[PDB]
Amino acid sequence: KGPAVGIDLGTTYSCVGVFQHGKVEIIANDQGNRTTPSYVAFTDTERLIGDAAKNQVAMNPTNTVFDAKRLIGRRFDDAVVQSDMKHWPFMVVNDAGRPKVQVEYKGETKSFYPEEVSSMVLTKMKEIAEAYLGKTVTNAVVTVPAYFNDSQRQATKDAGTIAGLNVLRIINEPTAAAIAYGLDKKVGAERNVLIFDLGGGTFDVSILTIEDGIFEVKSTAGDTHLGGEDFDNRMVNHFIAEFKRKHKKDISENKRAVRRLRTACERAKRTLSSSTQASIEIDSLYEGIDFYTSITRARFEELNADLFRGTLDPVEKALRDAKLDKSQIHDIVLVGGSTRIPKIQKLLQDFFNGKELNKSINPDEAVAYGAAVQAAILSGDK
Numbered sequence: 001k002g003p004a005v006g007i008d009l010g011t012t013y014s015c016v017g018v019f020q021h022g023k024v025e026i027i028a029n030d031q032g033n034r035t036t037p038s039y040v041a042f043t044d045t046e047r048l049i050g051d052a053a054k055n056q057v058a059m060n061p062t063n064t065v066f067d068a069k070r071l072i073g074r075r076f077d078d079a080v081v082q083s084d085m086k087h088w089p090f091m092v093v094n095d096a097g098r099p100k101v102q103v104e105y106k107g108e109t110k111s112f113y114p115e116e117v118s119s120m121v122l123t124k125m126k127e128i129a130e131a132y133l134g135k136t137v138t139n140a141v142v143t144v145p146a147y148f149n150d151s152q153r154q155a156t157k158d159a160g161t162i163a164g165l166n167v168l169r170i171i172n173e174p175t176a177a178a179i180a181y182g183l184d185k186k187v188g189a190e191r192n193v194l195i196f197d198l199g200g201g202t203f204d205v206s207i208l209t210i211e212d213g214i215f216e217v218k219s220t221a222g223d224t225h226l227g228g229e230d231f232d233n234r235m236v237n238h239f240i241a242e243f244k245r246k247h248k249k250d251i252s253e254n255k256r257a258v259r260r261l262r263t264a265c266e267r268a269k270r271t272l273s274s275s276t277q278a279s280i281e282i283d284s285l286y287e288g289i290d291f292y293t294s295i296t297r298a299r300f301e302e303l304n305a306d307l308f309r310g311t312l313d314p315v316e317k318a319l320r321d322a323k324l325d326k327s328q329i330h331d332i333v334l335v336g337g338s339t340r341i342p343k344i345q346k347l348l349q350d351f352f353n354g355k356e357l358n359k360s361i362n363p364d365e366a367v368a369y370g371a372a373v374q375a376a377i378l379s380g381d382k
């Protein structure tokens, strides 16, 4: 009897948890990180998955694959596929109607279906759970967006199967976040729950009804092309402008310099969720020139003020769509690292006239956490 795990297979990051000894442990990976980039890369000599692949994207852009969740269960001709292809540095090719990513690997052209890319991410999740537990892991609950269709769900199950997992169930991300908070451990009148999920690359607002432990998705809204990366990118452009003033050089077209800056911005955005100042510290950013600087929480908020305000439009839209008043939402659940941003929490809480936000489970972990609870239930370990 190996325990079952919960796996959040995310667009930008993935996360795995396990229920044991009465609580969920979110498992840190081989780099010590509790989330792993949903990235895979191929070199002359090896296949990288997770942090190692993300860390070399600028050095090897055409052979580094990400956003495979944007392709999973899609057909090559799909409008979304054709549009998304224009933003990716890797090739997507048509295999008799199905998209495949095409890379070079150990000197040969190789191509992979979306679910094969995702199975590699799921193999890494599996292995880092096995390293932490010291035993084999086979059973898992895997999560997907509430708006996934049959094709997209079945392709994600296929990624699981290819990875050597027995997928116990596919459950929706917003339901998993609600299970994490024990919101379905509840009898009495129907409760409306709003999940506000601002991930690295997508923004999902979901209203669920939960009645005697049974979920229904009442409405969904959001923007599948807005996420924490957009806020990072506002900071990147701000610091490109600053480096130009201070050194009269535009780094804009050195992709290695821009990626090092972007990584420093992603770290600074997380730092600004807890502190009012964060540094940007980069040795030899460009032609040997160092870049050591800093930013306030206020300036980061200013750079993103329109996008932050704009997150309330999908909330209004979910509410209209669900025929519900603000006041009829019983619980609000935060998901995604960006929901730690104080200014976002203020905007959302003021929108809900002071209503408290469920945020005590790390929001970048909450989907894996709910999946791990459901996995243990389905296994009989809870």
Ligand SMILES: [Cl-]
Pocket: 010, 011, 012, 013, 199, 200, 201
């Ligand atoms: Cl994500």
Ligand SMILES: [Mg+2]
Pocket: 010, 011, 173, 197, 199, 336, 367
């Ligand atoms: Mg997510």
